[PDB]
Design an enzyme around this catalytic site. Structure first.
Site, PDB file in Angstrom:
ATOM      1  N   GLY A 160       0.870  -1.127  -0.031  1.00 38.31           N
ATOM      2  CA  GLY A 160      -0.108   0.019   0.025  1.00 38.31           C
ATOM      3  C   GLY A 160       0.912   1.235  -0.012  1.00 38.31           C
ATOM      4  O   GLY A 160       1.113   1.938  -1.287  1.00 38.31           O
ATOM      5  N   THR A 161       1.482   1.478   1.243  1.00 37.26           N
ATOM      6  CA  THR A 161       2.545   2.173   1.660  1.00 37.26           C
ATOM      7  C   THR A 161       2.780   3.789   1.890  1.00 37.26           C
ATOM      8  O   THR A 161       2.243   4.617   1.565  1.00 37.26           O
ATOM      9  CB  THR A 161       3.961   1.865   0.876  1.00 37.26           C
ATOM     10  N   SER A 162       4.085   4.202   2.466  1.00 37.07           N
ATOM     11  CA  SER A 162       4.639   5.549   2.634  1.00 37.07           C
ATOM     12  C   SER A 162       5.891   5.467   2.527  1.00 37.07           C
ATOM     13  O   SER A 162       6.704   5.103   3.362  1.00 37.07           O
ATOM     14  CB  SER A 162       4.221   6.116   4.112  1.00 37.07           C
ATOM     15  OG  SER A 162       2.779   6.478   3.979  1.00 37.07           O
TER      16      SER A 162
END
Lengths: 241, 238, 222, 212, 233, 237, 232, 198, 199
Positions: free
Chosen positions: I3-5
């Site tokens: 998904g992420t950052s």
């Protein structure tokens, strides 16, 4: 992957592999065929007897392609099995698409077709087999007999023979068969056929087998005794002379 | 031994040359072109009397407007006819018109050098030659010689097989700019009668023509028989 | 999902005369309500006195024209510079179109010229190659607005001699190349008014034994 | 589309209409729905215009090759089967066709085979195929006799296409007639339906309720 | 098969007396996210051709690299690469158009709308369009995306027809373009303020301008607009 | 082919070398920011269009190749060369580094010495260019052997040239500016022409230099080509 | 030679592909043909052979595109296979790039197509020689193609048996014909004379002679028979 | 579907098989023979998907005839079914499955017994006394279960079918244009041509 | 999927990669200590987003390529590495969900950053941000990114930009990892919640 050109021309213009293949046919047990007014007969020499073999099951020289056509051969037995399988298939495939069995000339052509493709394809040698193919076209009475060689060449014959001593028995027939007076009966015909072989067999009904093909899928293989009635008759007829 | 598509030091293909040698041994076959049609005729050469002399077809129909005669290992010619017949019918289908005779011949010839070890699956060249005769509306009546070398030539008349040089020479002399169909029929018969070992008759010879009118027809043993006795009588008087 | 087809509209018309034939198309290429070009030629001389147009999805039409032109070129190489008969050409095209039977060329295609007796000839095709020699044929967006007209003024359908009771039809006389051209323009100017995909220009190709000649008429640009 | 074909002592009558629509749009009324496979064989067109035309034109190319290889006329039994068998190879891929394969051979007499794109192959005496079929079978079933004179048979045939052309929106234009004899087919011409209709109501007295 | 992801927007063009002019903004949008602002969508091939590209950037990038290889390869065993046998607009276009059509045909399109502008060896203005479906067309004005709808109406009023081309000058035509670019910036939510423009001229040759901006805009009337109907303040 | 003779060598390669020796001479000279290529083209007849039978080939945009021996083999190698240099670039982005490239040809030539149903190459190829870190001149035998070079030559007048090269290396260990190397090569082609002087010959020179050609590969033409031809004519006569 | 000339994939101790050399012999025994050109045209004059007086004369000239075509000597089928290959390349360059294929470039291609048969096993080297002419974006061109893979560009040249005579006559004529610019019929006569120099036994006439020319405004065309009468 | 019925009595096997072939709205043929003779003492009735139906039957017949000739022998009515089932088994996980149902009625000359085999399109073989394909069993089985007797004379079989066909004619909507009936016994295969008003 | 950052920022001495630690499947956090920083070569790293299965399988295959490349052409440019990623992402657009940032250090080029979004396109940049949580820091990052920053400053910039992404994005969370890449080798940092939240 093995496509080496085995059947190839030589300076004189011959394909030695096709010729060595005929050499193998001249080695085979003699085979003959003659056609009457209303029938066709096939004859075949068979080595000796032999006192210790089993005849019922062991491959008999005449084979059925369809119920109205048969095939006879001289030369390599193992090879002829291959031509018989393919031929028997093309017969049933013809029925399946054209809704009519093969004509004797059509089948004959198909076989000779294979024989030729093996003289022109790489990775393969020609068939050590030459054949007599005989029968009656469907809904037809006029008799048919054809011969095919390892070349792939074929042609019709009123009488023909192939294999060992074929030359002797062709010379015999060239004399004993009148195109205008072809053996009007089955009997008259089977007689000439038994006699043609009796130059080359060296004994009576022991070696000879006969198969009689008559119109509308009517084929029968004479059992030794009936053949021995023509053998008994021929030795006493020649005698008086 | 040494490869199939090998070159000699004279720049010849051993096999194609050794192929032509097999053709020299073949039955004779002559073809004569005219403004009235083309005539092809052949020597059946039945190796024994017993052999039914008319199961010997060395002249076949390729399409209604094209016929062809053969010489040499005739067995090899089955593939070539099959292809020629297909090629001609295919073309009809794609263009709703007859294939030009040259085109048809050029298609057969391509087939001829496709041998060796495009995707040439064939071990050796064909061992047979073909006279190809027909009529198209562009270049009227025509005759072609199609070797196993892939090359072809157009001829006003030509022989192939056993008696070809003797018959070619004889053709050189006898062929003129304005022969009728019936003159040509006879020269074929005459020239065959010269070079064939046997006494030419209706059972060891066959004759055919191809006219724009009725296309390709193979003369039945009866019709040709009359032309033979038309020669004996034409020859008798001088 | 990606739709591989599209519609560039346009209308094309084929008419055959006694010793001549015309193949006219409008000049306007489109997408939905936008115009892509007020001048993008749709009718093509393909050699051997053959003209053609593959209306509909101009990409598939371009593809098809290129192929046929090239088919001609190979017919010359492969068959000794023989001229391609209009019928022979029509047959060829059926094979082209049918090659893509299961992923059709999204076009209605028409060719014109002269048969082998020098008589005006028009053929019309399907997207999949069904072909029929035709006397008079419109294709495209406005084909509906044009066919009834031609049936009427070309083939005199439904007309009868005055006072004949309706018992003796109008004589089916042979038109000129210049009366045909009138009907072609009158068809396109009429369509132009009632169909939003027909306008800008009207380029006509005329085929007579003297060769392939061309004419162009301005068309309303709304 | 209305196509039909029957067998009688005089051989086979074959008759079709000429109309081809694109929904409600009558695109042409000059459509050859009898395919002249070759001089002895005929095929009708129903379902796929290109499908029938293309594949039956091909049949002609397959029937030619056959005669060349066997120096003999192809049976109708075997020519129909060639088309049928091909079609069966494509089953599921979308081909549309419903056609009668007609011919008169010495060997088998006048024969008619029905071959559809589902692979179905059927020998029959009377076959009508298409949007008009129901109509044509009515007229046909009423006057069908094995002893129709060549000349009546032609009319029974033509009349049937007329009966359908009239009711069927999708059938119209003209009628193409064909008579198939052992020596080949003979085209018995085209007949504008408009004109035919009137002529026929007057000769026959039928189509009574149609003012005119 | 696919669907566009990072995308390029209106590419507009027209032709004038001597050459052609082509322009395209410098944005790589990501849906409505204006993600990448330093994107050149004008790809010059030779000194005589410029290829404007709209649509999927991933795909564009790939076209761009085909064009480098076309040049590379054209030079191979070609001692007249930079002369008689130089890549010509007609050639470059036909190639791409071939590739685009093959791709829709393998149901695997390059998700772009391309315009190839240029000048041929014999002075002739070249300018043709080609897209994801393989549809190709040509006209005195050519635009993609919104440009098709907004730019053309304007550019066509300058070159309405062929006869008009000899009368349009480079300064008249270049102003048209710079205006349309403004109009698109006003009315296209997927547009950028920064754009690049290029001119291919038979005399001046190719002139390529990067980092332009749309200037002299009108936003003053805005201060007076209040509410959406009956609101007064 | 792929058959060792009892001495450990491969005779078919050894014969392919004979073919090369029968070849026209070609050379390469490395300079301090590039390389120069040169070749003798024999005039078989006065019917050859001068300057129209170009034998120096370009690979990618930054590599030149020249060969002596069987011209077609040479092209066949440069064709594989181009296919290989495109592959590398497509994936790795950078235009192919010279040493990497030299091995790409070296692996492929060598490949043709491993099977007895494929004949090895009948050329000795001199190639090279300018990459990420310097200039490189390479020469590649039918063996698949190849090495970096200060100077290189192959063909008939291969020593006549190697001699002239061994002098430039000795009497110039500082470097040798591209322009000088161009003329210097021209001279070496004229001198080497002494062996094979039966026929008249056409000169051909290419060069790849960071300053003079900006890193790209180009064909010394017109004026600069005249100086070179002049410079050479002076040291013959 | 015994071992080394058995196939194409074999170098002789002296570095020679014997089969290749043997295939050149078929050319040297092929009927003569000549090529020559100016700046506006290029001409192919070709002597045709025949098997008989009843035979036709085999065409030594084949068109490849609207602006290019060639002349042969050696095996006809190999000319067909190579001229068919050439017809496709010209065609590919047209179809895909709306570009006429450059004469120079056709040479490179036929060179590469021939070279693969001299390296691969199972395949023989081609046995035909070809002269190619064409007007491309850089003018008029003539090439000499050899089965070895060696294509060369020239103003003029000849191949076939006896070709040596016509080739020497061109070495002389050079400065004249180069400049038969703007003159079609004069360039043909100049080529037609050249052909005579390697003639010997017979003497060119309608059936023998075949001529082709391409040029600035002249699409490549062939002339045979009555059409060449004007030059005998 | 069409009516495919089968009944194995004491000396023989009777196979009924409707004569109607319908395409959509019109009944195209009122005299069809949904049967193929595979071998002198083995008959196969079939019903299902258009086209597949015959293609399969003719294809099977061909292989039996080919086998018959290769070994100059007649395969056992069991063997033949085991082969026919195997071919339908393949067809099932095939690209396009044949959708054909069959009945094999044979007279095993070695055991001197009549045998009946029903095999659906899935290759589901079961050997029965009376069988039927599709909806045919829904009407008839209630009757066969009641009246069927392993020792019935062929005429008792034909009588029991007649009663089965009537119920099919009464309660079934499709008008299948009557049936073709055939008997397979030690003497061969023959068609009862008189099943009209028997 | 990640998904992420994630982000990569070039600064004066080279470049720093940074990422959150959380990988979710639905609302359940499958792994809260994921190392989203992946090494494809000594000083060429990447940050992964979208399908783990995919991004891993890719990183793995690139590494392999860079390893073989290294064996025969010496060391590869950050550019050459980015190229290999894109060739895979583009040539398989239809079967991949990977958004990868590629960051590395050449001595000649110092820090470089290439972003490779869904399409398979490539864009070289000063800094890049990606993943579910990057939509919220476009505003912040752009306003505070400055070119040629100090290492201390770049770490702050990442630590702040990420802390915000974590704050708002539920799909992102955990610890904040960073990888530093300079001439002085490779440094690995980590900041726990108790620290970055308090900003």
């Amino acid at each position: 992957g093995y496509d080496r050109a085995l059947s190839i021309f030589s300076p004189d213009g011959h394909i030695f592999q096709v010729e060595y293949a005929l050499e193998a046919v001249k080695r085979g047990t003699c085979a003959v065929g003659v056609k009457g007014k209303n029938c066709v007969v096939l004859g075949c020499e068979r080595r000796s007897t032999l006192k210790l073999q089993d005849t019922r099951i062991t491959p008999s020289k005449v084979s059925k392609i369809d119920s109205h056509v048969v095939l006879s051969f001289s030369g390599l037995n193992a090879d002829s099995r291959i031509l018989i399988e393919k031929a028997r298939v093309e017969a049933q495939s013809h029925r399946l698409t054209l809704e009519d069995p093969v004509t004797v000339e059509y089948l004959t052509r198909y076989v000779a077709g294979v024989q030729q493709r093996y003289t022109q394809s790489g990775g393969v040698r020609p068939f050590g087999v030459s054949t007599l193919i005989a029968g009656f076209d469907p809904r037809d009475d006029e008799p048919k007999l054809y011969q095919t060689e390892p070349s792939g060449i074929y042609s019709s014959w009123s009488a023909q023979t192939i294999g060992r001593n074929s030359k002797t028995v062709r010379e015999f027939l060239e004399k004993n068969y009148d195109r205008k007076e072809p053996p009007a009966t089955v009997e008259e015909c089977v007689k000439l056929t038994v006699r043609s072989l009796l130059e080359v067999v060296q004994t009576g009904a022991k070696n000879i087998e006969i198969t009689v093909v008559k119109p509308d899928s009517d084929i029968v293989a004479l059992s030794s005794e009936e053949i021995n009635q023509y053998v008994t008759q021929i030795e006493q007829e020649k005698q008086e002379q | 031994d040494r490869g199939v598509s090998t070159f000699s030091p004279e720049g010849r293909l051993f096999q194609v040359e050794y192929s032509l040698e097999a053709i020299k041994l073949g039955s004779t076959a002559i073809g004569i072109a005219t403004k009235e049609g083309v005539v092809l005729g052949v020597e059946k050469r039945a190796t024994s009397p017993l052999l039914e002399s008319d199961s010997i077809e060395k002249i076949v129909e390729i399409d209604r407007h094209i016929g062809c005669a053969m010489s040499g290992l005739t067995a090899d010619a089955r593939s070539m006819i099959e292809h020629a017949r297909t090629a001609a019918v295919t073309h009809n289908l794609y263009y709703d018109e007859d294939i030009n005779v040259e085109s048809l011949t050029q298609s057969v010839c391509d087939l001829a050098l496709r041998f060796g070890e495009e995707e040439r699956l064939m071990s050796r060249p064909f061992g047979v030659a073909l006279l190809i005769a027909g009529h198209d509306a562009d270049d009227g009546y025509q005759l072609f010689h199609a070797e196993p070398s892939g090359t072809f030539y157009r001829y006003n008349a030509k022989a192939i097989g056993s008696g070809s040089e003797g018959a070619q020479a004889e053709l050189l002399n006898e062929w003129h700019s304005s022969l009728t169909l019936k003159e040509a029929e006879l020269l074929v018969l005459k020239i065959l009668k010269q070079v064939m070992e046997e006494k030419l008759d209706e059972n060891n010879a066959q004759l055919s023509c191809i006219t724009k009118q009725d296309g390709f027809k193979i003369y039945d043993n009866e019709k040709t028989a009359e032309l033979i006795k038309e020669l004996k009588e034409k020859e008798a008087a001088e | 999902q990606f739709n591989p087809y599209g519609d560039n509209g346009g209308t094309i018309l084929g008419i055959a005369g006694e010793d001549f034939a015309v193949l006219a198309g409008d000049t306007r290429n489109i997408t939905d309500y936008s115009i892509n070009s007020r001048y993008e030629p749709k009718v093509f001389d393909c050699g051997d006195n053959i003209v053609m147009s593959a209306n509909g999805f101009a990409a598939d039409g371009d593809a098809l024209v290129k192929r046929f032109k090239n088919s001609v070129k190979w017919y010359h190489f492969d068959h000794n510079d023989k001229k391609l008969s209009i019928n022979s050409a029509a047959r060829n095209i059926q094979h082209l179109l049918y090659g893509k039977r299961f992923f059709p060329y999204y076009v209605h295609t028409i060719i014109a010229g002269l048969d082998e007796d020098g008589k005006g000839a028009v053929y019309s095709f399907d997207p999949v190659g069904s072909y029929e020699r035709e006397q008079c044929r419109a294709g495209g967006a406005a084909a509906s607005l044009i066919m009834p007209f031609l049936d009427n003024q070309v083939n005199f359908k439904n007309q009868y001699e005055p006072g004949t009771n309706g018992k003796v039809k109008k004589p089916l006389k042979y038109l000129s190349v210049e009366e045909v051209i009138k009907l072609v323009r009158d068809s396109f100017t009429s369509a132009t008014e009632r169909h939003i995909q027909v306008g800008d220009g009207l380029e006509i190709l005329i085929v007579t034994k003297d060769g392939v000649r061309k004419e162009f008429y301005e068309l309303k640009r709304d | 589309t209305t196509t039909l074909a029957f067998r009688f002592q005089g051989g086979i009558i074959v008759a079709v209409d000429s109309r081809a629509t694109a929904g409600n749009w009558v695109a042409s009324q000059t459509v050859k729905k009898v395919i002249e496979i070759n001089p002895f064989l005929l095929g009708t067109m129903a379902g796929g215009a290109a499908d029938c035309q293309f594949w039956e034109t091909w049949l002609g190319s397959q029937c030619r090759l056959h005669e060349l290889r066997e120096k003999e006329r192809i049976s109708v039994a075997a020519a129909s089967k060639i088309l049928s068998n091909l079609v069966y190879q494509y089953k599921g891929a979308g081909l549309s066709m419903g056609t009668m394969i007609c011919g008169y051979t010495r060997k088998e007499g006048p024969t008619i085979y029905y071959v559809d794109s589902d692979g179905t192959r059927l020998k029959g005496d009377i076959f009508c195929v298409g949007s008009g079929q129901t109509f044509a079978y009515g007229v046909l079933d009423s006057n069908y006799k094995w002893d129709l004179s060549v000349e009546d048979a032609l009319y029974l045939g033509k009349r049937s296409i007329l009966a359908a052309a009239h009711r069927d929106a999708y059938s119209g234009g003209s009628v193409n007639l064909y008579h198939v004899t052992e020596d080949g087919w003979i085209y018995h011409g085209n007949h504008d339906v408009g004109e035919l209709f009137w002529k026929v109501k007057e000769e026959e007295g039928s189509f009574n309720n149609v003012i005119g | 098969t696919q669907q566009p992801i990072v995308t390029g927007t209106s590419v507009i063009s027209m032709k004038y007396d001597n050459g052609v002019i082509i322009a395209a903004d410098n944005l790589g949008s990501y849906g409505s996210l204006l993600r990448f602002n330093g994107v050149e969508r004008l790809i010059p091939v030779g000194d005589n051709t410029v290829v404007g590209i709209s649509g999927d950037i991933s795909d564009m990038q790939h076209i761009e690299r085909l064009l480098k290889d076309l040049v590379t390869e054209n030079a191979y065993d070609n001692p007249l690469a930079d002369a008689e046998e130089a890549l010509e607009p007609s050639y470059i276009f036909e190639y791409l158009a071939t590739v685009m059509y093959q791709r829709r045909s393998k149901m695997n399109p390059l998700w772009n709308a391309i315009i190839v502008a240029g000048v041929q060896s014999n002075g002739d203005q070249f300018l043709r369009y080609v897209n994801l479906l393989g549809v190709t067309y040509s006209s005195p004005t050519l635009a993609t995306g919104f440009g098709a709808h907004m730019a053309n109406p304007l550019l066509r009023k300058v070159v309405d027809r062929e006869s008009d081309i000899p009368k349009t000058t480079v300064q008249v035509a270049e102003e048209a373009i710079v205006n349309a670019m403004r109009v698109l910036y006003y009315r296209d939510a997927r547009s950028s303020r920064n754009f690049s423009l290029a001119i291919i001229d038979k005399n001046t040759g190719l002139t390529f301008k990067k980092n332009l901006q749309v200037e002299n805009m009108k936003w003053d009337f805005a201060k007076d607009i209040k509410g959406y109907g009956t609101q007064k303040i | 082919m792929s058959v060792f003779s009892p001495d450990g060598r491969n005779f078919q390669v050894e014969y392919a070398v004979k073919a090369v020796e029968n070849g026209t001479t070609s050379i390469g000279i490395k300079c301090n920011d590039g390389v120069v290529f040169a070749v003798e083209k024999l005039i078989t007849s006065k019917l050859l269009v001068p300057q129209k039978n170009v034998k120096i080939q370009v690979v990618d945009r930054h590599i030149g190749c020249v060969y002596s021996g069987l011209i077609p083999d040479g092209r066949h190698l440069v064709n594989r060369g181009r296919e290989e240099a495109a592959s590398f670039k497509k994936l790795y982005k950078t235009p192919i580094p010279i040493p990497a490239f030299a091995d790409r040809l070296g692996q492929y030539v060598q490949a043709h010495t491993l099977y007895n149903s494929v004949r090895p190459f009948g050329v000795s190829t001199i190639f090279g260019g300018v990459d990420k870190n310097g200039a490189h001149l390479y020469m590649l035998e039918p063996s698949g052997s190849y090495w970096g070079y200060k100077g290189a030559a192959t063909g008939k007048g291969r020593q006549s040239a190697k001699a002239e090269l061994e002098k430039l290396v000795d009497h110039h260990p500082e470097g040798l500016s591209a322009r000088e190397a161009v003329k210097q090569a021209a001279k070496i082609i004229y001198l080497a022409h002494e062996d094979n002087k039966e026929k008249d010959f056409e000169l051909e020179i290419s060069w790849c230099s960071l300053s003079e050609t900006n890193g790209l590969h180009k064909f010394v033409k017109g004026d600069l080509l005249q100086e070179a031809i002049d410079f050479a004519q002076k040291e013959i006569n | 030679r015994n071992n080394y000339d058995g196939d194409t994939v074999t170098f002789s101790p002296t570095g020679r592909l014997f089969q290749v050399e043997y295939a050149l012999e078929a050319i040297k025994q092929g009927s003569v043909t000549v090529g020559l050109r100016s700046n506006t045209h290029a001409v192919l004059v070709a002597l045709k052979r025949n098997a008989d007086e009843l035979s036709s004369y085999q065409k030594k000239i084949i068109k490849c595109d609207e602006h290019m075509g060639l002349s042969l000597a050696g095996l006809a089928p190999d000319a067909r296979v190579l001229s068919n290959y050439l017809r496709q390349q010209c065609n590919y360059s047209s179809l895909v790039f709306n570009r006429k294929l450059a004469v120079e470039r056709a040479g490179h291609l036929l060179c590469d197509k021939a070279q693969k048969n001299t390296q691969s096993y199972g395949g023989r080297p081609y046995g035909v020689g070809l002269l190619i002419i064409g007007y491309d974006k850089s003018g008029a061109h003539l090439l000499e193609f050899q089965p070895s893979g060696n294509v060369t560009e020239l103003y003029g040249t000849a191949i076939g048996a006896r070709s040596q005579g016509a080739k020497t006559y061109l070495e002389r004529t050079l400065d004249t014909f180069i400049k038969i610019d703007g003159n079609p019929d004069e360039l043909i006569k100049a080529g037609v004379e050249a052909i005579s120099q390697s003639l010997r036994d017979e003497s060119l006439t309608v059936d023998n002679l075949s001529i082709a020319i391409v040029g600035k405004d002249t699409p490549f065309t062939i002339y045979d028979g009555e059409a060449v009468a004007k030059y005998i | 579907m069409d009516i495919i019925l089968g009944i194995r009595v004491q000396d023989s096997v009777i196979l009924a098989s409707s004569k109607a072939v319908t395409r959509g709205i019109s009944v195209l043929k009122d005299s069809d023979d949904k049967t193929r003779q595979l071998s002198p003492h083995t008959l196969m009735s079939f019903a299902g998907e258009a086209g597949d139906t015959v293609q399969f039957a003719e294809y099977i017949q061909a292989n039996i005839q080919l086998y018959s000739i290769r070994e100059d022998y007649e395969l056992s009515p069991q063997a033949v079914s085991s082969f026919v089932r195997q071919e339908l088994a393949k067809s099932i996980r095939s690209r396009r499955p044949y959708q054909v149902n069959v009945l094999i009625g044979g007279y095993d000359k070695k055991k001197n017994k009549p045998e009946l085999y029903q095999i659906d399109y899935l290759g589901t073989k079961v050997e029965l006394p009376y069988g039927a394909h599709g909806y045919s069993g829904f009407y008839t089985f209630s009757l066969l279960d009641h009246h069927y007797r392993p020792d019935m004379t062929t005429e008792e079989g034909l009588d029991l079918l007649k009663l089965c066909v009537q119920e099919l004619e009464k309660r079934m909507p499709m008008d299948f244009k009557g049936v073709i009936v055939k008997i397979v016994d030690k003497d061969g295969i023959r068609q009862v041509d008189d099943f009209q008003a028997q | 999927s990640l998904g992420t950052s994630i982000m990569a920022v070039t600064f004066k001495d080279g470049v720093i990669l940074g990422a959150d630690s959380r990988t979710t499947t639905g609302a359940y956090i499958a792994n809260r200590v994921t190392d989203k920083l992946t090494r494809v070569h000594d000083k060429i790293w990447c940050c992964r987003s979208g399908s783990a299965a995919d991004t891993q399988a890719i990183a793995d295959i690139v590494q392999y390529h860079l390893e073989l490349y290294t064996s025969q052409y010496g060391t590869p440019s950050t550019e050459t590495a980015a190229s290999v990623f894109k060739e895979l992402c583009y040539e398989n657009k239809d079967n991949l969900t990977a958004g990868i940032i590629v960051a590395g250090y050449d001595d000649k080029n110092k820090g470089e950053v290439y972003t490779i979004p869904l399409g398979g396109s490539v864009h070289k940049l000063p800094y890049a941000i990606a993943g579910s949580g990057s939509t919220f820091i476009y505003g912040y990052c752009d306003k505070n990114f400055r070119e040629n920053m100090s290492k201390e400053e770049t770490v702050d910039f990442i630590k702040h930009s990420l802390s915000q992404a974590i704050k708002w994005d539920g799909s992102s969370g955990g610890v904040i990892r960073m990888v530093v890449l300079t001439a002085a080798g490779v440094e690995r940092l980590i900041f726990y919640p108790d620290e970055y939240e308090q900003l």
